[PDB]
Amino acid sequence: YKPSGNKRVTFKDVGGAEEAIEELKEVVEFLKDPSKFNRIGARMPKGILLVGPPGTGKTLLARAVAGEANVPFFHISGSDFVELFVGVGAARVRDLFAQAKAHAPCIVFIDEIDAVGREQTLNQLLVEMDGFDSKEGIIVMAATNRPDILDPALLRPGRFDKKIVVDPPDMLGRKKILEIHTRNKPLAEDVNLEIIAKRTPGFVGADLENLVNEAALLAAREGRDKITMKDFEEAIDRVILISPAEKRIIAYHEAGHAVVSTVVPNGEPVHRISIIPRGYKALGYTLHLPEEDKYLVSRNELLDKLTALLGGRAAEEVVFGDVTSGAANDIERATEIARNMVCQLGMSEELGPLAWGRNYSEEVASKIDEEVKKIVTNCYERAKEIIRKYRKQLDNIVEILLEKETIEGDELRRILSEEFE
Amino acid sequence: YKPSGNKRVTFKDVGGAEEAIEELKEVVEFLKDPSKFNRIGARMPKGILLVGPPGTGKTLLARAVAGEANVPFFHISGSDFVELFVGVGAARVRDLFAQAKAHAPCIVFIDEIDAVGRDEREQTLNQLLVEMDGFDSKEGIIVMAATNRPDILDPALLRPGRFDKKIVVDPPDMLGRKKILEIHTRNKPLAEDVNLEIIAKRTPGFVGADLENLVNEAALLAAREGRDKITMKDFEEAIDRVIAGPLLISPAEKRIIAYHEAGHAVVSTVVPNGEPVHRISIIYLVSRNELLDKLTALLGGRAAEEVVFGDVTSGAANDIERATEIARNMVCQLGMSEELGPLAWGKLRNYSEEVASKIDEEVKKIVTNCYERAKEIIRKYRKQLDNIVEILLEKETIEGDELRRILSEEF
Amino acid sequence: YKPSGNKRVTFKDVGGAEEAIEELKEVVEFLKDPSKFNRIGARMPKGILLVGPPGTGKTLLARAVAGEANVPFFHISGSDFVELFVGVGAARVRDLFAQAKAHAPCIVFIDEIDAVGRHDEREQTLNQLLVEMDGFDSKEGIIVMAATNRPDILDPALLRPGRFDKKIVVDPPDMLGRKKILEIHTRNKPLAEDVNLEIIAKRTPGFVGADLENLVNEAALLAAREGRDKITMKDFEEAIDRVILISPAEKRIIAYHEAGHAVVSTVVPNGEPVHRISIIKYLVSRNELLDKLTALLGGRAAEEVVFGDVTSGAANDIERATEIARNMVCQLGMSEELGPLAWGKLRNYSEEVASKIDEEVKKIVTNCYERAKEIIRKYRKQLDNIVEILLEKETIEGDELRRILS
Amino acid sequence: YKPSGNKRVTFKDVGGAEEAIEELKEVVEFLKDPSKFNRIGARMPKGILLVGPPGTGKTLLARAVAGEANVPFFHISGSDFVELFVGVGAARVRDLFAQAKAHAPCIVFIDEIDAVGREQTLNQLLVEMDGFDSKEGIIVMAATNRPDILDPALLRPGRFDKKIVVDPPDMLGRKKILEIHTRNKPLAEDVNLEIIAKRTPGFVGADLENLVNEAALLAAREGRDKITMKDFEEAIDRVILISPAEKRIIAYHEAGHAVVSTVVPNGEPVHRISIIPRGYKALGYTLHLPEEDKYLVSRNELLDKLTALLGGRAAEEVVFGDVTSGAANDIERATEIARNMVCQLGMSEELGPLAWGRNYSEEVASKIDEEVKKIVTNCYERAKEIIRKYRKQLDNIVEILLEKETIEGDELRRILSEEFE
Ligand SMILES: Nc1ncnc2c1ncn2[C@@H]1O[C@H](COP(=O)(O)OP(=O)(O)O)[C@@H](O)[C@H]1O
Ligand SMILES: Nc1ncnc2c1ncn2[C@@H]1O[C@H](COP(=O)(O)OP(=O)(O)O)[C@@H](O)[C@H]1O
Ligand SMILES: Nc1ncnc2c1ncn2[C@@H]1O[C@H](COP(=O)(O)OP(=O)(O)O)[C@@H](O)[C@H]1O
Ligand SMILES: Nc1ncnc2c1ncn2[C@@H]1O[C@H](COP(=O)(O)OP(=O)(O)O)[C@@H](O)[C@H]1O
Ligand SMILES: [Mg+2]
Ligand SMILES: [Mg+2]
Ligand SMILES: [Mg+2]
Ligand SMILES: [Mg+2]
Ligand SMILES: [Zn+2]
Ligand SMILES: [Zn+2]
Ligand SMILES: [Zn+2]
Ligand SMILES: [Zn+2]
C-alpha cells in the first residue's frame, strides 16, 4: 500500500469542532516529536476512535492531524476488508502495519471501522495494535458512526482506549463551515452566511459543502461571476427538523433512559444526557455501547441493562399513552440481548445450560421465542414501574433538558443526586 | 467508436418534459463553456441517469442537450456489450472514452445501461467504473445513461463521482401529448378539421414514441388514398392502428384510475396526519397514528374502487404492497403490536412458526382495519370524491393553487 | 450489379400469404408514386425483413413487390459476401447501392442476410451495409428487403430504427393456401378434369410453396414419362409419395383443445376476441381475470368432456392459470379470506397462511374449470362444428367461429 | 474452435462392432462424395446417435467414420457446456456449426450429449440442426450412455432420427479388441488371447486396452522384452459377472417388462428383449426412452407406461416372493412420471388442474405425496395382477431368453403372438 497523495489539510480547514481539535493538539505535538514524551514516560494512546454521524469531518480531523504534524497519512476503509477471499483481509492488515512502521511517525486511519470490528481480519488487527511500539510515533485513528456495533476488544486499554465525539454543528458551527468552504469562492456583497447558518438546521459539514456547490452551480448556470444570496437560498431547497411536541417526546425518552439507569442497581453511570437530534453523547446512544471495562456479565446485570434500554419507550408510553418509532433501535438491541441470554448464555429457565443455534426443532424454536419474549416484556414492565414511581424526577429532568439540551459533567451529578438523594 | 451522424436535435424537439429540461439546462451551459463553472469551482456531475418508461424521450433529451450545446453525441447501447467475447466489452469501453476525450466537450450516452450495469459483464462494468473515475469533469465530458429498469442497477454505478445525478422522465399527460403532436406535425400538411387537442385527449397512455408513430400512420393513411392533407379521420383511424401494431388507457379504465387517484386524495385530506396533496393526475420519527393514517390513505384508491364500482382491479397492487410493508414494520420492528410485544421479530426470520403465524394475524388486522376505515371515509365523502373525479377526467391533472382550492371548497 | 433479368412476378403468383401481401401493398403504392408519400411526410421503412422457413416465398414476395410496382429488382445473396478477399465485400455493397440510386425507385433484395448480418471482414462488410442504409434517401423510392430463417443470428444494429425495422413473418401455408399455391403452379399445365387440388392440399400438410411446386413438377414428369398429354389426379397422388407427421387422432385432440379455448373466450363476457385458430389493459378487474382463467382452461375442459381422458397438452395453460390465481391471491388482494394484503416478495409468511393461499388458489382455479366445462357441454354441437372445419382447413378466422356459435 | 489434431483412425482400428460399422458404411460413402446421393435425392440423416455403455468405442467409431472418409472431425463434449455463464453455451454452439459449414464435408461429434439434451444451450442446438443443409456433407454424431435422459425434441425427424446401439463385446469380440491393441506390442509365444477373451467376461474395449497396458507394465517392471501369458493373467486381477440364479432373475425382470407392455393397451411395441448385463437393446432400457413419435400423451397412456415400467419388479415379487435392487431405476422413473402427472399435468383427483411447484404448503406437499404414492402403488398391483394372469407366458419367454439371450426381429413377433394370440 502507498500513502495518501491527497491534498494536505490542517485544523485551519476544520470548522465547528473546537473541542475535538483541543484534545487532538497533543497528538499533533506527539507526532511532531515523540521524543519529548518518550523521554519522560508520557504514554500516548495507540488508538483514537472518532465518533459521530457521517459528514461531520471525522476523516477531515484525522487528515488535519497528519497535515498539522506534517506526517504521512494512510487512509484505509473498513468496508474494503469485508467480502474478501480467505486470508486476504489479514494479509492486508499485516501489510498496512508493516508500511506504517517503515514510514513512522505516521497516522493510520481506518474509516468505517465497524465494518471490520463487529474473525481473522479483526483478530489480525488486534495483534497489530498490541504488536506495535507507540514510542515509534505511530497513532491509529478510526472513525465510526456505529460504535455500538464494535467489538469491545477494540476499546480495551492499549488499543482504541480514547475516543472523541464529533457532533453536528449548531448555528455558529454551521456559519464557520460555510466560511471555510467559501474562502476561495466569489460571493456577492448581499450574501449573509449567518442567515444561511440559521436556515440550515440539521445540516452537517458535508451537506453545507454541498449546499455551497449547489449555489455555485446556480450562478454558473446563469453565467454569473458572483454567488448571490438568492443562489444560497435556492440551493438549500434543492438539497432538502423537530417540532416542540417532538422535542418533548425525545426529552422524555432520553430522561427515561436516565431515570431507569439510575434506579436499576447495575445501571451504567450516567455522565451525559442530550436531546440533540443525533449527538452521540446522549445516553440513548451510550447505552448501546459495548462493555469495555469488564469481561464477564451476570444475568442480573443484563436484565438491568435491558430494562435501561427500554426506559426511553417506557417513559413515552407512561407519559403520552402511546409510543413512537424512536425506540426501534432499543427494541432491536434489547431483543438481541435476550436471544443471547436464552440461546448462548444458558440464562433461561426452561431451556437450560445449552447452546441453541439453526440447529434445532420448531418445538424448541417456539420455546426460545416464548422465553425471549418473557425477558423483554418483564424488563419493559419493570421499566414502566420505575418511570411511574419516579415520575416527578422524570418530569424535572425533562424540564432542564428542554432548557439546556445537553447536561454533561459535575452539573449532571448535582442534578441526579438532588433528584435521587 | 464515432460520434452520431444523425440529425442534431434541440429542446424545440422535445414535448411535455419541462422539468427534465430545466434540470438539464445546467448541463447545456456547462458544455457550451465549462470555463464558466471551472472558473468558480462549480462542480458538475460526471454521469446523469435518465429514468423512465420506453419511448418517453430519454434518448431524445440526451440528444437535445448535445445539440443545444453543439457538441458531439456518442450513442451507445448497453445491449451491445452483453454476449461479447472475452474482454471485447472492456476494450470497447476503454476505446469509447478514449474517443470522448479526443472530442471533448461531448456527450457519451449509454442507452439501456441496465444491460451492462445489472463474469465478463463484471469486467465490462468494472471497466466502465474505471473510466468514469478516470476522466476529468473539467474537460467537458458528460456521460448520460438511460434505463426504465433502475432497480436492477449496481449501486456502484450510483456512487458519488459516477451516475450520482438522476432525472426522471415521465409519460406525457394530455397537454404534453398535445405538444408532442404539434412538434411532430410542424412540417406536415394537416386538414383544417384536425384537432390535436381531441387526439391528445383520446390517447391517454401514449408516450412520445407512440405519438410520433401515430402521426406517421396518419400520414400513411392519407398517402395511400393519394390525399395531399392529413385529416382528423386519418388520426382517429391511426390510433386503432398504432395500437394493434405495438397500450391505450380505455375510457372505462380512465374512470377507474380517476376514482383511485381521487380516493387517495380524499382519504389523505380527511385523515388527521395525512400528507398534503399537491397534485393529482391520471397519468425522523413517526407515531403509531401517523402510520395508521398513512396506511389508510395508501388504501384509499382501492377503497374508492370497491365502494364505487363494487369490483376491484389490479391497479392497487403497489399500494397493497406498501401498506403491508408498513404493517409488518409496525409489528416486527416498532413493537406496535397488540400481542407481540416490544420485540424485534426478524434479522430474515429467526422465530418459530407459532410466532410467524401471530405476526401474519396482526399484520392482517392492522391493514384490514385501515382498509375498512378508508372505505368509511370514501362513503362519507362520496360527493366530493365524485366532484374531484369529474374535474380530473376533464383535465387529467389537477395541481397548484387549483388543487389547493378544490380541496378547500370541498372540505 | 444490374436489374434482375428473371421473369416478372406479381402477387397473382404468390399463394397463401395474404397477410404479408397486405402489408406489402403500401410499399407497392409508394414505389409506383413516391411523391404521394413524400409530399405529406409519410415516411416509409428503408429496410423490410422477411422472416420464415426456406421455400415459403420470401424471395418470391420481394420479386412480386417489384413486378407489381413495375420497378427494377436487384437480387443479392448474403452468402456471396462471406469468403471474400479484404475490402471486396464493402466495395460490392457500395457499388450495389450506387446502382440502386441510379435506378430508383427500386427494390434491393438481400437473401440470407444472416450470412453477413452476424468475426472479421464481416464487420467491415456489415458496417458498410449500415452506412449505406443510413446514407440513402428513402424519398427516392428505394426500399431494401431482406430474408432470413435465422433472425436471432442477426446483429441488432441492423434491426434498429431507420434500418431493418419492419419485419414480416412468412409462415407455412394452411390447406387453402396450399390449394392456391397449387393453382398458381398449375396455371400453365394440362390438367385432367379429375384433378382435385383441394384434396391434394389436404393430403400435403407441412408442405411449403417450394414443396408444392416440386410436387406439381413430379406429377408432370410422371405423366410425360408415360407418354400422356394430361396430368391426372393419380399423377398428383403418386407425386406426393415422391416429394416425401401427426396422428389424425392427435390432430382431433389438438383441434378440440384449440376450439375449446376459443368457445370459452367468446362466451365469457370479458374474454379476448378470437382473431385466429390454428392446429399447427393497464388495469384488469377480478372478473376479467376470472374470465381469462376460465378461457385458459377451455382446451383442457374440452378434452375432458369430449374424450373423458386428458392429455399433457394443457400443461402450459394449467401453469398460466395457476400463475394468475396465485397473483390474484398474493398480490392483488382479490381473495375472500386473505385480505388486501401482499403475501410474499420469496416467502415472508407462516405455514398457516401458506396453506390458506393454496386453498384459495385451488378454489379459484377449480371454480373456473367447472365453469369452462359447463360452457363446453352447453356449446358442444358448435364446438363439434368448429372442430370439423378446423380439421379440414387447419386454420379458421374468428368471424367464422362467432358465426358458428350462431 | 479448431478441428481435432488427434491421430486418424479407420474401421480397421475398431473391434467387435461389425453391425455398427455396417450401418455407418453409407455415412462414409456419403461423406466421400455427397453428390452421388444429392443427385438422386438420397436423403441422409442429419443426426446419428451412438448408444452404449462407456468404453465401448462410441467415440472411436465416430472418429473411424471421419478417418475412413478422410474428412475433418470436430469433437465436442456435452459436459463442457453445462456450468457455463449466461449465453456462452449457445454462442459456442453457434460457433461450432459456423466452423462445421466452413470445413464441410465433415463430422461434428458431441460426446455426453445427455449433458446438454435433458434451455438456451439445447434450444440453440436444435435450431442449428434444423438450420444446416444435409447436402453440404455435414453429419452430426452424438454419443450417450444415458439416452433415457434425452429431450425427445432431439430425436425428432430431421435431427438425431437414427441411432445405433453399441453393446459390450462377447468372447469373440473381446479377442478381436485384444488383437487390435496388441498389434504393435511384443507378445511371447505362449500368449493366447482366446483364453484371455474367455476369462474377461463383462470387460469392454476400454477395459481390455487397459488390461493390455497393465500386462506391458508387468513385463517392463521386470525389464522384459516380450509380454507373457502370465503377464496377461496377472493384469486381469489388477483391474478387477453373473450367477445362474441371478441370470434367472434378470430373465424374469426383462420378461416381466415384456409381458406387461404387451398386455397393457397403450403398451410400447416390444421389438427386442435381452439379458445381456448392459445391452441397451433390452426392453428394460427401451421403456425408459423419451417419446419421440408423439407430442401428446394421455393419462391412460402414462398409467400403461408406468405399469410396464414396474413389470420387471412385479415379476420378481410374484415369482421369487422378494425383490432385488434391479428395479431401482424403474422405481425412480415411475415416480418421476407420477409426480409429473400430479404436479404438472393436472392428472390427479384431488389436486385439480393446478401447477404445483417448492411453491406450496406442507398440507399440499402431503397430498401430493399421497397422490403420487397411490398412482405408483395402483400401477404396481396392476402389473402383478397381469404377471399372475399371464404366468405361463412369462415362464415361456424366460425359458427362451435363458437360451437365446437376445430376441430381436420377426422371431420375437412369432413368439409373442404364439403366446398372446
Ligand atoms: N467540521 C467541518 N468543518 C469544515 N468542513 C467539514 C466539516 N465536516 C465535514 N466537512 C466537509 O464535508 C466533508 C465531510 O466528510 P468526512 O470528513 O468524511 O466526514 P465523516 O468522516 O464524518 O463522514 C469533508 O470532506 C469536509 O470537506
Ligand atoms: N417528449 C417527446 N417529445 C417529442 N417527441 C418524442 C418525445 N418522446 C419521444 N418522442 C419521439 O419518439 C422517439 C422516442 O424515442 P426515445 O427518445 O428513444 O425514448 P426513450 O429513450 O425514452 O425510449 C423520439 O426520437 C421522438 O421522435
Ligand atoms: N407462397 C408461394 N406461392 C407460390 N409459389 C411459392 C410460394 N412459396 C414458394 N413458392 C415457390 O417455391 C420457390 C422457392 O421459394 P422462395 O421464393 O425461394 O422461398 P424462400 O425465399 O422463402 O426460400 C419460389 O420461387 C416459388 O416458385
Ligand atoms: N470396439 C472396440 N474395438 C477396439 N478398441 C476399442 C473398442 N471400444 C473401445 N476401444 C478402446 O478403448 C477406448 C474406448 O473409449 P471410447 O471410444 O470413448 O468408448 P465410449 O465412447 O463408448 O466411452 C477407445 O479409445 C479405444 O482405444
Ligand atoms: Mg462518513
Ligand atoms: Mg428506449
Ligand atoms: Mg430460400
Ligand atoms: Mg464414455
Ligand atoms: Zn433510546
Ligand atoms: Zn394508488
Ligand atoms: Zn392450450
Ligand atoms: Zn427394469
GROMACS .gro file of N, CA, C and O in nm, chain C residues 335-385:
model
  204
 1167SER      N    1  -5.859  -1.216  -0.288
 1167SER     CA    2  -5.912  -1.337  -0.226
 1167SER      C    3  -6.020  -1.306  -0.122
 1167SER      O    4  -6.020  -1.200  -0.058
 1168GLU      N    5  -6.110  -1.402  -0.104
 1168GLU     CA    6  -6.207  -1.397   0.004
 1168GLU      C    7  -6.136  -1.359   0.135
 1168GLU      O    8  -6.142  -1.246   0.181
 1169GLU      N    9  -6.065  -1.455   0.187
 1169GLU     CA   10  -6.029  -1.457   0.323
 1169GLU      C   11  -5.896  -1.395   0.352
 1169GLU      O   12  -5.868  -1.359   0.464
 1170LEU      N   13  -5.811  -1.381   0.251
 1170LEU     CA   14  -5.674  -1.339   0.278
 1170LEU      C   15  -5.652  -1.188   0.282
 1170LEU      O   16  -5.547  -1.143   0.324
 1171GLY      N   17  -5.751  -1.111   0.240
 1171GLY     CA   18  -5.747  -0.965   0.257
 1171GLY      C   19  -5.666  -0.887   0.153
 1171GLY      O   20  -5.603  -0.943   0.066
 1172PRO      N   21  -5.669  -0.754   0.164
 1172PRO     CA   22  -5.594  -0.668   0.073
 1172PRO      C   23  -5.451  -0.657   0.115
 1172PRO      O   24  -5.402  -0.547   0.147
 1173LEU      N   25  -5.385  -0.771   0.118
 1173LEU     CA   26  -5.253  -0.782   0.167
 1173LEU      C   27  -5.163  -0.846   0.063
 1173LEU      O   28  -5.206  -0.929  -0.014
 1174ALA      N   29  -5.037  -0.805   0.062
 1174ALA     CA   30  -4.935  -0.868  -0.019
 1174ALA      C   31  -4.871  -0.977   0.064
 1174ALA      O   32  -4.812  -0.951   0.168
 1175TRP      N   33  -4.883  -1.099   0.016
 1175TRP     CA   34  -4.817  -1.212   0.074
 1175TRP      C   35  -4.703  -1.258  -0.016
 1175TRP      O   36  -4.726  -1.314  -0.123
 1176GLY      N   37  -4.580  -1.236   0.028
 1176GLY     CA   38  -4.464  -1.278  -0.047
 1176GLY      C   39  -4.385  -1.162  -0.104
 1176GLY      O   40  -4.438  -1.051  -0.120
 1177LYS      N   41  -4.257  -1.187  -0.132
 1177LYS     CA   42  -4.173  -1.093  -0.208
 1177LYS      C   43  -4.165  -0.958  -0.138
 1177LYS      O   44  -4.092  -0.943  -0.040
 1178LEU      N   45  -4.015  -1.484  -0.319
 1178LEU     CA   46  -3.984  -1.549  -0.191
 1178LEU      C   47  -4.090  -1.519  -0.083
 1178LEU      O   48  -4.177  -1.431  -0.099
 1179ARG      N   49  -4.080  -1.591   0.029
 1179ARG     CA   50  -4.194  -1.613   0.119
 1179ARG      C   51  -4.168  -1.556   0.255
 1179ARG      O   52  -4.075  -1.597   0.323
 1180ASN      N   53  -4.250  -1.459   0.293
 1180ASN     CA   54  -4.234  -1.387   0.419
 1180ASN      C   55  -4.357  -1.409   0.510
 1180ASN      O   56  -4.407  -1.314   0.571
 1181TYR      N   57  -4.405  -1.532   0.518
 1181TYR     CA   58  -4.527  -1.562   0.591
 1181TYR      C   59  -4.535  -1.708   0.637
 1181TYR      O   60  -4.464  -1.794   0.586
 1182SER      N   61  -4.626  -1.732   0.731
 1182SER     CA   62  -4.635  -1.857   0.805
 1182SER      C   63  -4.688  -1.969   0.721
 1182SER      O   64  -4.743  -1.948   0.615
 1183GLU      N   65  -4.674  -2.089   0.773
 1183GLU     CA   66  -4.732  -2.207   0.716
 1183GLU      C   67  -4.886  -2.198   0.713
 1183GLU      O   68  -4.948  -2.239   0.618
 1184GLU      N   69  -4.945  -2.145   0.819
 1184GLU     CA   70  -5.090  -2.127   0.827
 1184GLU      C   71  -5.141  -2.048   0.707
 1184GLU      O   72  -5.243  -2.081   0.650
 1185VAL      N   73  -5.071  -1.941   0.673
 1185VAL     CA   74  -5.107  -1.863   0.557
 1185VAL      C   75  -5.072  -1.934   0.426
 1185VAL      O   76  -5.150  -1.932   0.334
 1186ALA      N   77  -4.955  -1.998   0.419
 1186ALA     CA   78  -4.920  -2.079   0.303
 1186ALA      C   79  -5.037  -2.168   0.263
 1186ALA      O   80  -5.079  -2.172   0.146
 1187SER      N   81  -5.089  -2.240   0.361
 1187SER     CA   82  -5.195  -2.337   0.340
 1187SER      C   83  -5.332  -2.273   0.299
 1187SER      O   84  -5.410  -2.334   0.225
 1188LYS      N   85  -5.358  -2.151   0.347
 1188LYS     CA   86  -5.477  -2.078   0.310
 1188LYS      C   87  -5.466  -2.026   0.171
 1188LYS      O   88  -5.564  -2.014   0.101
 1189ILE      N   89  -5.346  -1.987   0.132
 1189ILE     CA   90  -5.322  -1.943  -0.002
 1189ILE      C   91  -5.350  -2.061  -0.103
 1189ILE      O   92  -5.420  -2.042  -0.201
 1190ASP      N   93  -5.298  -2.181  -0.073
 1190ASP     CA   94  -5.320  -2.298  -0.157
 1190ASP      C   95  -5.471  -2.332  -0.171
 1190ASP      O   96  -5.519  -2.357  -0.280
 1191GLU      N   97  -5.545  -2.331  -0.060
 1191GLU     CA   98  -5.690  -2.349  -0.063
 1191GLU      C   99  -5.756  -2.251  -0.154
 1191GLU      O  100  -5.842  -2.287  -0.229
 1192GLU      N  101  -5.720  -2.124  -0.142
 1192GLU     CA  102  -5.785  -2.018  -0.217
 1192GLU      C  103  -5.750  -2.021  -0.365
 1192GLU      O  104  -5.837  -2.000  -0.450
 1193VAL      N  105  -5.622  -2.042  -0.395
 1193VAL     CA  106  -5.577  -2.058  -0.532
 1193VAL      C  107  -5.649  -2.181  -0.594
 1193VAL      O  108  -5.708  -2.171  -0.700
 1194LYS      N  109  -5.649  -2.293  -0.524
 1194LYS     CA  110  -5.717  -2.413  -0.571
 1194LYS      C  111  -5.865  -2.389  -0.600
 1194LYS      O  112  -5.922  -2.444  -0.697
 1195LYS      N  113  -5.927  -2.307  -0.516
 1195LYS     CA  114  -6.069  -2.284  -0.521
 1195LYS      C  115  -6.103  -2.200  -0.643
 1195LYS      O  116  -6.200  -2.224  -0.710
 1196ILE      N  117  -6.022  -2.098  -0.669
 1196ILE     CA  118  -6.041  -2.017  -0.786
 1196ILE      C  119  -6.024  -2.100  -0.917
 1196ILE      O  120  -6.107  -2.090  -1.009
 1197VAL      N  121  -5.917  -2.179  -0.926
 1197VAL     CA  122  -5.888  -2.249  -1.048
 1197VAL      C  123  -5.996  -2.353  -1.075
 1197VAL      O  124  -6.047  -2.364  -1.183
 1198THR      N  125  -6.032  -2.427  -0.973
 1198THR     CA  126  -6.135  -2.529  -0.982
 1198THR      C  127  -6.272  -2.475  -1.021
 1198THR      O  128  -6.344  -2.536  -1.102
 1199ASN      N  129  -6.309  -2.362  -0.963
 1199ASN     CA  130  -6.434  -2.298  -0.995
 1199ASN      C  131  -6.440  -2.256  -1.143
 1199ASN      O  132  -6.540  -2.278  -1.212
 1200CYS      N  133  -6.332  -2.194  -1.190
 1200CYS     CA  134  -6.321  -2.156  -1.330
 1200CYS      C  135  -6.319  -2.282  -1.420
 1200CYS      O  136  -6.367  -2.277  -1.531
 1201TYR      N  137  -6.265  -2.392  -1.371
 1201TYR     CA  138  -6.259  -2.515  -1.450
 1201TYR      C  139  -6.399  -2.572  -1.473
 1201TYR      O  140  -6.436  -2.606  -1.583
 1202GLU      N  141  -6.474  -2.586  -1.367
 1202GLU     CA  142  -6.606  -2.632  -1.377
 1202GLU      C  143  -6.687  -2.546  -1.472
 1202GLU      O  144  -6.766  -2.597  -1.551
 1203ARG      N  145  -6.667  -2.415  -1.465
 1203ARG     CA  146  -6.740  -2.318  -1.548
 1203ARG      C  147  -6.707  -2.334  -1.695
 1203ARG      O  148  -6.795  -2.331  -1.779
 1204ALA      N  149  -6.580  -2.351  -1.726
 1204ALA     CA  150  -6.538  -2.385  -1.859
 1204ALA      C  151  -6.610  -2.510  -1.908
 1204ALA      O  152  -6.658  -2.513  -2.020
 1205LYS      N  153  -6.615  -2.613  -1.825
 1205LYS     CA  154  -6.674  -2.740  -1.867
 1205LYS      C  155  -6.822  -2.725  -1.899
 1205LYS      O  156  -6.874  -2.790  -1.995
 1206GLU      N  157  -6.891  -2.642  -1.820
 1206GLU     CA  158  -7.032  -2.613  -1.841
 1206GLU      C  159  -7.054  -2.547  -1.973
 1206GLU      O  160  -7.154  -2.574  -2.040
 1207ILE      N  161  -6.964  -2.456  -2.009
 1207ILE     CA  162  -6.973  -2.384  -2.135
 1207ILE      C  163  -6.951  -2.484  -2.251
 1207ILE      O  164  -7.021  -2.483  -2.349
 1208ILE      N  165  -6.854  -2.571  -2.235
 1208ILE     CA  166  -6.825  -2.672  -2.335
 1208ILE      C  167  -6.948  -2.762  -2.360
 1208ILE      O  168  -6.984  -2.784  -2.473
 1209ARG      N  169  -7.010  -2.811  -2.254
 1209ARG     CA  170  -7.123  -2.900  -2.266
 1209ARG      C  171  -7.243  -2.827  -2.325
 1209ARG      O  172  -7.322  -2.884  -2.402
 1210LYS      N  173  -7.259  -2.701  -2.287
 1210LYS     CA  174  -7.367  -2.620  -2.336
 1210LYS      C  175  -7.350  -2.589  -2.484
 1210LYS      O  176  -7.449  -2.573  -2.554
 1211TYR      N  177  -7.225  -2.580  -2.530
 1211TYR     CA  178  -7.197  -2.546  -2.670
 1211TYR      C  179  -7.135  -2.660  -2.748
 1211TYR      O  180  -7.061  -2.638  -2.843
 1212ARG      N  181  -7.165  -2.781  -2.707
 1212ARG     CA  182  -7.099  -2.898  -2.761
 1212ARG      C  183  -7.115  -2.905  -2.910
 1212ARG      O  184  -7.018  -2.929  -2.982
 1213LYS      N  185  -7.235  -2.881  -2.960
 1213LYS     CA  186  -7.257  -2.904  -3.100
 1213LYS      C  187  -7.174  -2.808  -3.183
 1213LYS      O  188  -7.115  -2.848  -3.282
 1214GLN      N  189  -7.170  -2.683  -3.141
 1214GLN     CA  190  -7.096  -2.583  -3.215
 1214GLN      C  191  -6.947  -2.605  -3.198
 1214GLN      O  192  -6.871  -2.581  -3.290
 1215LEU      N  193  -6.908  -2.656  -3.082
 1215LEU     CA  194  -6.771  -2.699  -3.062
 1215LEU      C  195  -6.736  -2.802  -3.168
 1215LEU      O  196  -6.631  -2.793  -3.235
 1216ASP      N  197  -6.827  -2.898  -3.187
 1216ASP     CA  198  -6.805  -3.006  -3.282
 1216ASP      C  199  -6.798  -2.956  -3.424
 1216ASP      O  200  -6.723  -3.009  -3.507
 1217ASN      N  201  -6.879  -2.855  -3.456
 1217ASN     CA  202  -6.877  -2.799  -3.590
 1217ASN      C  203  -6.746  -2.727  -3.614
 1217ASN      O  204  -6.685  -2.744  -3.717
   0.00000   0.00000   0.00000
